[model samples]
Target: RRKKRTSIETNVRFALEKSFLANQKPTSEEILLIAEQLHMEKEVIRVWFCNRRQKEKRINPCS
Candidate 1:
């Protein structure tokens, strides 16, 4: 079953940003914690982290 994409809430986005800053590469367990707290799917959270890292690298290639 394919679910339609939806926009993430502001608070959730902030929480993700905070976590990303703290640890860009979070373990599956850590992703699960954030997913539970934010009521988001673990897959969604995982993909978000992947995309976020790509975006950061695009902006700051030297990092």
Candidate 2:
């Protein structure tokens, strides 16, 4: 079963974005850590980080 959409909560979004700032690629342990901390699915967090980096690259080339 899957929800049609995952409307991220503002606070959760902030937390995830902040983590992205720290490190776009988080290891399994860290992903699990944030997953537990934010009460988010590990898979969701993993995919978000992947997509987010691609988004950033499109907007701002990292040199």
Candidate 3:
């Protein structure tokens, strides 16, 4: 069963923000480590960063 909903709490959101800041596209190992540390799914972290980059690109436009 999916443990949590799409909505992330403040701490989780902050963690995700740091993840994006430290590395927009993190490696699988890094993703796994963060997911485990935060008690979240690797897939969730992966998807969040992916979407975050998409949003950033719209503003900054990666060359």
Candidate 4:
């Protein structure tokens, strides 16, 4: 069997956790920085943050 791809939720959670730990919102620039640290592409980091923010907005509709 082929290796499984990482889940979108997992990637989002990873990005959120990194942002929380770093005390900064995960902007595209920050995402790129994290992606560099992870040795991945900036686009991957951007998508992860996008999903993460969407999930948060869903949970906190008034925000």
Model 1 segments more than 4 A misplaced: 1-11, 60-63
Per-residue lDDT value at 6 in model 4: 42
lDDT score, candidate 4, position 44 = 57
> Lowest summed lDDT over 10 consecutive residues: which window, candidate 2?
1-10
What lDDT tens digits, residue by residue, belong to model 3 across residues 1-63? 022444444465578897688877788888788777867677677667776677777544332
After aligning candidate 4 to the native by TM-score, how far in Å is the CA of 38 from where it should be?
2.3
lDDT, residue 48, candidate 1: 75
What is the C-alpha local distance difference test score of each model?
Answer: 0.70, 0.71, 0.70, 0.58
**Candidate 4 segments exceeding 4 Å error:** 1-6, 9-12, 20-29, 59-63
Q: Which pairs of residues collide in model 2? A: none
lDDT of 2 by residue, 1-41 (tens): 02323444445667789889898778888888877775776
TM per prediction: 0.67, 0.67, 0.67, 0.49
Task: Order candidates by TM-score, high to low.
Answer: 2, 1, 3, 4
lDDT of 1 by residue, 1-63 (tens): 012233444456567888888898888788787777757667768777777678788545343
Between candidates 3 and 4, the one scoring higher on TM-score is: 3
> For candidate 2, what is the TM-score?
0.67
